[PDB]
């Protein structure tokens, strides 16, 4: 039976969500590609470049208009004339919106696509812009996190493909499932915290026992993400777990909230 | 047009002008154009990277302690490099030593990323320029057993596996959704594998893309996640408890034994899959060891890393080399300063910034990164470019010399200067490779050789793992597991002025963060990539940089369809995003 | 000495007697005597269970809902199925009804435990009685690769990979640390295998030790951990959240992606690595579908398991046949009640138990386990056991017996009922199985047909995960996400009298939980497990239960070295503490 | 170099510790085996039966006396004279005082061995016996839940080997580094037990949102171990995890400490 469509395309990125991507343990990267999805379009993995690369999105884009979901990884610059992201010689902003425009729904991966991560921190030197201020006639499902854990983009993934919807969505646009509780809601440390036992200088004795990163600048209380039950890379840790607090990475403007260091 | 000499290269935009934007299998956004004679040879070479972010921009007036975290989000393809950079820096700045069990978690840190990055690059990215996929579904399953069997002893190598594979990818293109192969290059006259080696290296192609997201397990270990791992100013947030109440808390015996048999699985995946596919793409396409040579019979340049020494970045701490090379001189290997404002310049001339003498390069801690968008007179107009003009500024990439030098950088660069330094296991390696396959040493300066260097480097990476994990286990059987230093954590122990470099070996090669502190805060942040080096623009002087240079005097089969472009370019791993930054 | 006739045997102690204790490669505690006659063939053979813990007697008095907990308990082996049988049977009793998601898992909890229990008693328990390692020693890596591939499509295969395997366990023996295979039989005239085979086999065995560890990740999920995962009394406790709020909490579809990819990997070992060893073992091994064939061609009991129809136990919903074959008569598969005090009983004249008249065999409703250690003259004494007297009481299980005949269960017992009472599936996988072998049906009653009825059994197991687990996407897709009932949750809502009975196929056989609650507690709580019934002991008429028939008429080619009894002994996966509990 | 020599005996038991020992993810238990110990004496593995394996038993506890670990799993019962559990004719405990006799140090695998378990629950019908107080003049350490989770087995196997001493333990036995803190005080659902937010009834639209299980019986409050940390099988999950209450498993007298569902 033929795979559901799908063009990916990269505005200014780092890449990360994409390698996140590539992480998942359950399924595979490559029983996705292979099985689950048609994986039309993607410069960080097709064989064709240049003028063959453009062949394949005009291609797609028009045989499959209408029918095609346009995952985004990273945003637009509205400063040069868009030209701080150049496609084809021309503005990121204009593959964005054309392929925008045929698509049944968009995924924006990442903080970048979603909110605006770091380019868009002070002070915005290119007016970097995330993707729901530029396209606003589309479903936009935001998957936040620098990057988001890679089991979480695959079980969105599955959960489309084998549920044939959108996942239900909090206000901000995010997938319920995986972005209705906060970080502290489900921490492992939180007995400390409620207890008062905290890290006070890294590798003190409450840090070679596990106590509460609060003091150390833990933003886990304001921020909303699975890291804390999901866990990354086939479940092995997360940051906390690993001793350093959450950066806030999935929340909207989490580069500007202070230090990384200050108390939340 | 104009022709003018450079290099030992005749650059001459005559003649028909190609266009690849955009450069699929890469990091980023990059634009390239060549112009080619009627012999389709390239006779000129432009290399133009199509983004900017402004971090440098960014970090001004950040906390120090914080700056990694910024950094970091460079690039996610070589995530951690720039967080260790960052924090060489600052503590270089504040004048901060790390216990020796953060610097060991560090450098292993570092060899992991080398292992993954290698080891994706060759098969996710580079692989395809090699390998025709399509010519695999003509193999015969037993002829590709046969193959692989007399490669290697890796174990999955049976005829049932090769024909299971096969059948995948025929069902895979039965329905006409060819995916990432479609619109490819597949039939070009330059494939010259058999069909059953396209099939190895297609199953091996899949079993990488599994086996990749493994490797990662230790970054999460150690800093939480990958990609952007957790660091600090002063060690490494991952507190070690082994014998004590609360280990569950902590890095523990569990956490330890989980790193072991990572390391164990990468080297054995390096050493028996993705070194015989270096050593028989090699074998069937030892032309490519003398196209694109570029720089790296002239100018070539490491930094060095991996200190074993504990806050010691000299020459008797490093385990990978520094140096430089000039003039094609390799019995001169030169000592590299990162403060020397003689040595390492950025210049902008053909770049879109301002400075206030665009003919001058300025070293990174005089560096300024005022965006300025002036494309000039290219074909087409300046939100619509049909031709870049490399006569004017043509690239968001600024130009790095090193004293007035264009060097390449990375695998090869690195493996190079080792050689040249008398490093006996660079030696050894090198000598059996080449041999291997009945080459001169000087094939290794090549398109060809990049990609041997780097499953080289990827085979030294999983070795070292395994030693830096038996350092970190001596030290805690001797009781020693102290990870971070504080004394200097908070801002008012810190200089009211002070100025620090944090350098490293990248995958892709030299990696320089510059930063100045004052009154509590960053003054100036200044990074220098490896691709800021190889993807360079041109200077005052109109030397090119590494891939303009290995593009030069490249024969075209078919100038409509880029691979021999392709081959060259990814033969750097270049990672456009870290080189703007 | 003495003689008499029973079941076609000639029970005989006369001549030399051996001992066999302890039994290894086996759960729990076992002894084994014989009496071979001046031919070296067994005239007289007795099982004895040398263990007891008395959970029938501990569950007295506890809460119903907790029971599951306790008897789960009884074995880490078969973990997982005391719990099923005991929430069914406290179902049974007070009336409850649990949702079809919740039937579903424990459907695809036993189906895992068949699994994992079948793919391990074929490598780690039964395999070293096939399989000679040391002989593995003089393989040639080459030829072991070619037998390999000409059996199966496994990729694991190379002339490389076999060389490693050797070398690695020459290295083990080297130093005389032979550990495992210290003192074994290697060298004995039964071992048939070529050396290659040897290889190929203790490569699997050691593939199948490292791969059994994912298998329970399934039971992990559903059920918490494994060993002795968690239930609950009115279906599961791992509540399911796919598109809410929260679903961080409980079964969403990150898990239940985990769960679908162990599914996948599991059926692929089973079907390529399990399933042509098995076979393999049949072909080198043909006489022993004449050996062992005891009451596999007599008496075979099933009770049946895996309802796919929530709520049903009869013969519509449930998906492995139940039925008995009495007296040889396989054209009459008998109906099978549980309640029916005229169908199963237990006989203790020959047990170390006290009933008020040891000549008449108990229904478990009316069941007694009043332990008393009383072994008579046994040529030392109480508490020095050097020939036990099975004239008399002579071990800690209880003898079952179905309408007063001694009957087989397990993986053999399961498919010849199912295959006569004309089930298509296991018609056709039977006759092929037998057909690629060249032997007649009656060749699965042996030994060897148990070793290849359990492999059977594995793959047919393996098949029925992914079908419960779509069964369950089903449900999820169409907005059904109930996990439990909790009506009757509080004990003011029971019967202030009730009993039930629980039942099901453990990976060994037929198992039943007969339980009496009273005043919210349990009263009675009777196990007949599925080694009660293959290990009994003899009952008021002589009658000699699986094990025993078993062995009768075996010759044995080395007195000393009993490989042929522990050949049968291992086929039928005994487990000794399931069987005394 | 040599490897370190192994007995390890079984008594009255599930042989839940010994299928625990082989789920280990790492090291996994075949280079545990292979690579690391001399396993000598192992029922469950070993292919020699009978009179072979006697002769295993008696040759290595003769000649590795005083230099071999010994393994225990389950316990013996003084009722019937030991005849509960007879090893070659013999009481069990014969076994255990031999093997106990030439061993340099005692690991006592599981709640059996630690404190009794299931068979020493009321009324104690053999009269089952940790294996402390019947050795009382050897060094053991204590290792217990029902079964201990694998890769601790592992983590404190290869702890052993590496730093060639015993790990520290509490008053009780238990090594420090994975029974040193209470399951509740590193449980995920604590922010719910701080809150109020508690399961009900099984499959409750708490349950349905991982809320902590105090009022279905949780035992977490009262027990050390590392499920809640270290988790089992590869980390995948534990009891809480999957929504049933800690029974208290590794706690001595567990069974006899009210109904599961009855709250701390
Ligand atoms: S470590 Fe962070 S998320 Fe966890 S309890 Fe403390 S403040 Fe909350
Ligand atoms: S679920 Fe149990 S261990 Fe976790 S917070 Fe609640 S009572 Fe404590
Ligand atoms: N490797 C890498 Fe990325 C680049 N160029 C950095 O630093
Ligand atoms: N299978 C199994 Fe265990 C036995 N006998 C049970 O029930
Ligand atoms: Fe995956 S591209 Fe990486 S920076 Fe923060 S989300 Fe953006
Ligand atoms: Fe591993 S034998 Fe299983 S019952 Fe509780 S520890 Fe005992
Ligand atoms: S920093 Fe990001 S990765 Fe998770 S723990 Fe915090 S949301
Ligand atoms: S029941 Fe046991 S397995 Fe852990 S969560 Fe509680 S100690
Ligand atoms: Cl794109
Ligand atoms: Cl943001
Ligand atoms: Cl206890
Ligand atoms: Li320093
Ligand atoms: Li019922
Ligand atoms: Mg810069
Ligand atoms: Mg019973
Ligand atoms: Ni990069
Ligand atoms: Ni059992």
């Known amino acids: 039976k033929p795979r559901i469509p799908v063009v990916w395309i990269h505005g200014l990125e780092c ?13 595979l990267a490559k029983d996705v590609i292979l099985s689950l999805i048609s994986l039309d379009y993607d410069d960080t993995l097709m064989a064709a470049a240049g003028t063959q690369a453009e062949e394949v999105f005009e291609d797609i884009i028009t045989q499959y208009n209408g029918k095609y979901i346009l995952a985004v990884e990273g945003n637009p610059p509205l400063g040069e004339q868009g030209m701080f992201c150049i496609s084809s010689g021309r503005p990121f902003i204009e593959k964005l919106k054309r392929a925008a425009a045929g698509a049944s729904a968009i995924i924006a991966w990442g903080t970048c696509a979603s909110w605006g991560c770091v380019q868009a921190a002070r002070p915005n030197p290119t007016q970097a812009t995330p993707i729901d201020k530029v396209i606003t006639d589309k479903p936009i499902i935001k998957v936040p996190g620098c990057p ?11 959960y489309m493909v084998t549920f044939d919807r959108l996942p239900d969505v909090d206000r901000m646009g995010r997938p319920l499932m995986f972005y209705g509780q906060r ?9 400390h915290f409620d207890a008062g036992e905290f890290v006070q200088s890294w590798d003190d004795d409450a840090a070679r026992k596990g106590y509460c990163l609060y003091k150390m600048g833990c933003k886990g ?35 500007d909230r202070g230090s990384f260091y200050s108390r939340v | 047009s104009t022709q003018y000499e450079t290099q030992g290269y005749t650059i001459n935009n005559a003649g028909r002008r190609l266009v690849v934007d955009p450069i699929t299998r890469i990091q980023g956004h990059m634009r390239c154009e060549v112009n080619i004679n009627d012999q389709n040879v390239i006779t000129n070479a432009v290399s133009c990277g199509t983004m900017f972010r402004g971090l440098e921009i960014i970090l001004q007036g950040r906390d120090p302690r914080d700056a990694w975290a910024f950094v970091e989000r460079i690039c996610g393809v070589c995530t951690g490099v720039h967080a260790l950079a960052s924090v060489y820096a600052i503590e270089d700045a504040i004048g901060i030593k790390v216990p020796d069990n953060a610097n060991i978690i560090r450098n292993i840190m570092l060899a992991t990323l080398w292992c993954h990055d290698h080891l994706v690059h060759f098969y996710q990215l580079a692989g395809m320029d090699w390998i025709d996929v399509l010519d695999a579904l003509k193999a015969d399953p037993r002829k590709t057993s046969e193959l692989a069997q007399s490669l290697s002893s890796w174990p999955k190598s049976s005829p049932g596996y090769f024909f299971d594979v096969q059948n995948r990818l025929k069902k895979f293109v039965e329905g006409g959704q060819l995916g990432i192969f479609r619109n490819g290059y597949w039939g070009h006259p330059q494939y010259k594998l058999p069909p059953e080696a396209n099939l190895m290296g297609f199953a091996h192609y899949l079993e990488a893309l599994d086996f990749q997201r493994e490797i990662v397990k230790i970054h999460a270990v150690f800093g939480g996640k990958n990609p952007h791992p957790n660091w600090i100013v002063g060690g490494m947030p991952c507190a070690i408890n082994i014998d004590e109440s609360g280990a569950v808390g902590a890095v523990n015996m569990e956490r330890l034994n989980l790193v072991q048999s990572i390391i164990t699985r990468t080297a054995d995946f390096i050493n028996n899959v993705m070194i015989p596919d270096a050593l028989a793409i090699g074998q069937f396409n030892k032309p490519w060891s003398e196209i694109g040579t570029g720089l790296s019979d002239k100018c070539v340049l490491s930094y060095g890393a991996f200190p074993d020494i504990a806050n010691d970045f000299g020459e008797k701490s490093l385990l990978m080399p520094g140096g430089a090379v000039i003039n094609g001189d390799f019995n001169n290997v030169l000592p590299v300063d990162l403060v020397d404002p003689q040595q390492v310049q950025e210049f902008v001339d053909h770049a879109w910034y301002r400075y206030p003498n665009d003919q001058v390069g300025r070293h990174p801690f005089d560096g300024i990164t005022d965006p300025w968008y002036n494309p000039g007179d290219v074909k087409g107009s300046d939100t619509n470019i049909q031709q870049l003009n490399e006569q004017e500024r043509y690239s968001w990439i600024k130009a790095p010399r090193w004293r007035g030098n264009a060097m390449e950088v990375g695998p090869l660069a690195r493996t190079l200067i080792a050689y040249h330094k008398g490093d006996a296991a660079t030696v050894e390696s090198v000598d059996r490779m080449m041999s291997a396959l009945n080459l001169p040493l000087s094939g290794i300066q090549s398109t060809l050789g990049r990609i041997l260097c780097r499953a080289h480097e990827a085979q030294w990476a999983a070795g070292k793992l395994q030693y830096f994990f038996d350092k970190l286990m001596t030290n805690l059987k001797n009781g020693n597991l102290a990870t971070a230093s504080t004394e200097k954590w908070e801002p008012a122990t810190w200089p009211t002025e002070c100025r620090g470099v944090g350098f490293t070996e990248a995958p892709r090669g030299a990696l320089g963060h510059w930063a100045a502190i004052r009154d509590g805060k960053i003054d100036l942040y200044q990074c220098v990539v490896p691709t800021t080096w190889n993807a360079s623009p041109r200077d005052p002087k109109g030397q090119i940089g590494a891939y303009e240079a290995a593009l030069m005097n490249t024969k075209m089969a078919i100038p409509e369809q880029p691979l021999e472009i392709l081959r060259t370019l990814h033969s750097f791993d270049p990672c456009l995003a870290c080189s703007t930054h």
Chains 1, 4 share one sequence.
């Open chain 1, 183 to 191: 970080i502290h809601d489900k921490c492992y440390r939180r007995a």
């Open chain 1, 15 to 27: 890449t990360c969500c994409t390698e996140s991507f590539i992480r998942s343990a359950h399924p």
């Open chain 1, 221 to 255: 209380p304001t921020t909303y993400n699975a890291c804390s039950s999901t866990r990354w890379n086939d479940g092995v840790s997360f940051p906390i777990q690993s001793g350093h607090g959450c950066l806030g990475c999935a929340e909207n403007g989490f580069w």
């Open chain 1, 148 to 158: 988001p854990i890679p089991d979480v983009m695959s079980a969105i993934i599955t």
